Design a protein around this ligand. Structure first.
Ligand SMILES: Nc1nc2c(ncn2[C@@H]2O[C@H](COP(=O)(O)OP(=O)(O)NP(=O)(O)O)[C@@H](O)[C@H]2O)c(=O)[nH]1
Ligand SMILES: Nc1nc2c(ncn2[C@@H]2O[C@H](COP(=O)(O)OP(=O)(O)NP(=O)(O)O)[C@@H](O)[C@H]2O)c(=O)[nH]1
Lengths: 411, 178
RNA sequence: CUGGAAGGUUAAGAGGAGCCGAAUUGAAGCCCCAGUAA
RNA sequence: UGAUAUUGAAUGUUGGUACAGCUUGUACAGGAUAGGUAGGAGCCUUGGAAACCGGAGCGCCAGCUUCGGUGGAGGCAUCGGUGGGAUACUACCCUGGCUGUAUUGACCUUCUAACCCGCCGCCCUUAUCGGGCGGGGAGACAGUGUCAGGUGGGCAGUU
RNA sequence: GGCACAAGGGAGCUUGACUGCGAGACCUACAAGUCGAGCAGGGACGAAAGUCGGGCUUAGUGAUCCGGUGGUUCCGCAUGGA
């Protein structure tokens, strides 16, 4: 399908426009430094036409600009934003230099004109020698009709996410997976800014991986609304069902990071990185294996996987691990069999003034969930609720997924 | 190695020749917000100005000294031809219409734009006064006397400074090349 | 778990010709070496 | 757990600044195939100005920039427009370097004076405190005052 | 709860399916909350007067403290601007 890309300079309403086209995933602030740092994809709709959209950026500047050039070539038409209020700047011609040697169609846009009187001053914007400028506004939806047509003229499954704290290798992890340079990797913390989509197929099966740029301590987040980026990570979690957790070869915040995932009723998998950094010899894995088991007990179903991004070892095993967690998270059981075992549990533990068990059935299949029909909803004890939990998780697999349990009254 | 004075350089650009004495001035983009680009009538001072006057404003444009005004649209005569001559000014009504024609004025430096005082309702007063962060300004000739270019550079420097750009902080002056 | 690269595979693909798929590249994992049994 | 003042002296290793001087931008033209600001007010001259042959940087691997003695008062011709240009610049500037100029910054050895001694002698003095002179050892770190990553079970607030 | 005079069909384009604006029902605790009188501006096959819609109430969670972006003949702490 046709691909469209927008390029420009800091402070030109790009991310803003892209969001106005569709969605609000793109982060928006007001300052020179805070800009989208890498490519991101999406979908659009304009008449029968249905092209996508590529968003780019304006310390480290060579990388992002280079990434923009990557987009430049593989695109179909070119959107070249520019500001209208302050006329023509040096950076405009600077980028124009590469655009001239870019043998691609160009459609220019002018932003920051949100009132009829401001619609003028377009004659000056005739330097590029390009076509007709079409004004647009970000705060208001002005002048977009002419722009789109300008573009339409030349116009002819599961998802899983990875999270962690900043500076762990999560960006290096992904790019290596695809085996493609897709996201920026740096040795400084919080290099990535916002979540990035990536769609690919594995073993005749398509998948969608997502990054979340890492997260600092919750009292450590005092910046120019960099929580505005942190929430994007939260939305991403809601978007996908499977979450992989990445720790470097333990800090309590990592437990706290796992806090949101577990309560979300989303399958969660434990992953480690940088295994090459530490000593690697006989029976080394055990020390971590029980340390994570000892530290993390409110989760048990999570399988433990080992990989090292730099040397790229065991990375093949990671993908399959994800598939196994999937059906486990989407699986119903025959109500006859489920209730068949509920009593055995109570036969071996005839000590519930006394609770009574009559029925239990699977209702929610999206996340393994069930409901028990008892006599006294108050009479229970959380330990007993923890008892019936393990029994069922041992009768069948239900591994790598959480379980929610409900206890209705007799009614 | 030596920075000459203003009273010496006017008498010396007599000797750097009938040539035209012009001034470069390095300004102090970061500061594009308060950039320094402009035009002002000159004291110690042949053009051919063609106007785009609309409505009644053509009636005062034909007596001030302009060569050709127009038949309210001769951009079709501008298409496929049009040796432009000196200066193009316009009025704030047909400017948009002329502008939507393309860059026949973009890389040729005559596009009407009301940031320069050239697109206004006073076309009679506009004919009579015209006849990387750098500004070029023709202040005069070689054959002018020594007291002409001093007032010319004084007027242009007072115009630049009168316009003390916002974000005045930091040095404003870098270089004067006469 | 440990090296030493050899034996090929390169793996979904990345790519695609004819007609869904040519050639051509393509990490791991398989000792393909034993020591190791935790 | 990193910065900054105590905190001083010389070696080399380098840096970063600025200041000069030299050189750099080959492109779809124009004797080839070069960045933001004037169509001249030619040069005779000179590793060739026709051909003519070194040198890099190189190369856009094309074919140029000048240091430039044969032919040489011959030569291209300021001069025009297969790219938005087009000369003699008033020439400013950036870019990328080189050269040196100076002003600092940092690592390597580091020496001693700093700052230290739950080291040994003498004196105050009858004194396992303290203090002053000596030696000795470590020596610019340590420790010491203010800014940033864990971490308190130590202290609260809480429905 | 309709008997076609409210389930056919040239044009009349066409969500006035709008901008102004208002007497009663409610519940009558009120706030709130809802549903339907009455009128200038052309804005219609329109010519005689018919127009604030998909002919039972059934929605875009609460439309909000939701403003941080924007037009200002409003103020601006001694007078100009900010
Ligand atoms: N007044 C006004 N401000 C606008 C308009 N469009 C955008 N802005 C402002 O400009 C800011 C910059 O836009 P943003 O999309 O964040 O830019 P970016 O994310 O850095 N990407 P880029 O710099 O390439 O455009 C926005 O946060 C918004 O405040 C507009 O039409 N009018
Ligand atoms: N030795 C070693 N280094 C690694 C490994 N994976 C990543 N790194 C390095 O660790 C650093 C972390 O880079 P990056 O992927 O950006 O980590 P991140 O910051 O957690 N991801 P993000 O940028 O999205 O926040 C990089 O310098 C990367 O080269 C690994 O397996 N081994």
């Amino acid at each position: 399908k046709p691909v469209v890309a927008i390029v420009g300079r800091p402070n030109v309403g790009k991310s803003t426009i892209f969001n106005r086209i569709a969605g609000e995933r793109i982060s928006i602030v007001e300052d020179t430094p805070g800009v989208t740092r890498d490519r991101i994809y999406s979908s659009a709709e304009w008449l029968n036409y249905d092209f996508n959209l590529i968003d780019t950026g304006g310390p480290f500047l060579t990388q992002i600009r280079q990434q923009a050039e990557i987009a430049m070539d593989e695109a179909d038409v070119i959107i070249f934003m520019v500001n209208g209020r302050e006329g023509v700047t040096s950076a405009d011609e600077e980028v124009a230099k590469i655009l001239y040697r870019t043998k691609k169609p160009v459609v220019l846009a002018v932003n920051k004109l949100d009132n009829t009187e401001m619609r003028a001053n377009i004659y000056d914007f005739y330097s590029l020698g390009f076509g007709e400028p079409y004004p647009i506004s970000g705060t208001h939806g002005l002048g977009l009709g002419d722009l789109l047509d300008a573009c339409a003229e030349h116009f002819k499954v599961i998802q899983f996410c990875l999270i962690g704290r900043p500076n762990v290798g999560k960006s290096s992890l992904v790019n290596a997976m695809l085996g493609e340079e897709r996201v920026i990797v740096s040795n400084v913390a919080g290099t990535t800014r916002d979540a990035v989509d990536t769609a690919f197929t594995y073993n005749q099966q398509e998948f969608v991986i997502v990054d979340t740029a890492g997260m600092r301590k919750k009292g450590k987040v005092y910046e120019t609304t960099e929580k505005y980026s942190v929430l994007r990570a939260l939305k991403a979690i809601d978007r996908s069902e499977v979450v992989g957790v990445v720790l470097d070869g333990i800090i309590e915040q990592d437990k706290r990071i796992a806090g949101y995932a577990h309560e979300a009723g989303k399958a969660v998998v434990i992953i480690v990185n940088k295994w090459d950094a530490v000593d690697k010899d006989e029976s080394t894995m055990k020390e971590f294996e029980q340390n994570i088991r000892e530290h993390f007990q409110f989760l048990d179903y999570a399988p433990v996987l080992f990989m090292s991004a730099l040397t790229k070892k065991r990375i093949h095993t990671l993908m399959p691990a994800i598939i196994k967690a999937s059906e486990n998270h989407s699986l119903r059981v025959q109500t006859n069999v489920l209730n068949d075992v509920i009593m055995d549990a109570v036969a071996m533990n005839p000590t519930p003034s006394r609770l009574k068990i009559y029925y239990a059935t699977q209702v929610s299949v999206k996340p393994p969930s069930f409901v028990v029909f008892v006599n006294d909803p108050e009479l229970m004890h959380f330990s007993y609720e923890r008892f019936l939990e393990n029994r069922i998780r041992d009768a069948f697999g239900f591994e790598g997924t959480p379980i929610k349990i409900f206890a209705r009254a007799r009614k | 190695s030596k920075a000459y004075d203003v009273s010496e350089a006017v008498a010396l650009v007599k000797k750097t020749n009938d040539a035209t004495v012009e001034v470069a001035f390095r300004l102090g983009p970061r500061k594009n917000d308060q950039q320094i680009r402009g035009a002002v009538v000159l004291p110690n001072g042949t053009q051919r100005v063609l106007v785009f006057a609309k409505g009644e404003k053509a009636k005062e444009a034909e007596a001030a000294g302009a060569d050709f005004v127009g038949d309210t649209d001769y951009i079709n005569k501008i298409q496929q031809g049009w040796f432009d001559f000196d200066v193009i000014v316009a009025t704030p009504d047909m400017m948009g219409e002329v502008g939507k024609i393309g860059r026949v004025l973009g890389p040729k430096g005559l596009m009407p734009n009301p940031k320069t005082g050239t697109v206004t309702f006073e076309v009679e007063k506009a004919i009579g006064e015209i006849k990387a962060g750098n500004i070029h300004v023709p202040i005069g000739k070689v054959s002018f006397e020594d007291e002409k270019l001093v007032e010319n550079f004084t007027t242009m420097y007072d115009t630049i400074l009168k316009a003390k750009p916002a974000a005045a902080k930091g040095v404003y002056v870098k270089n004067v090349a006469v």
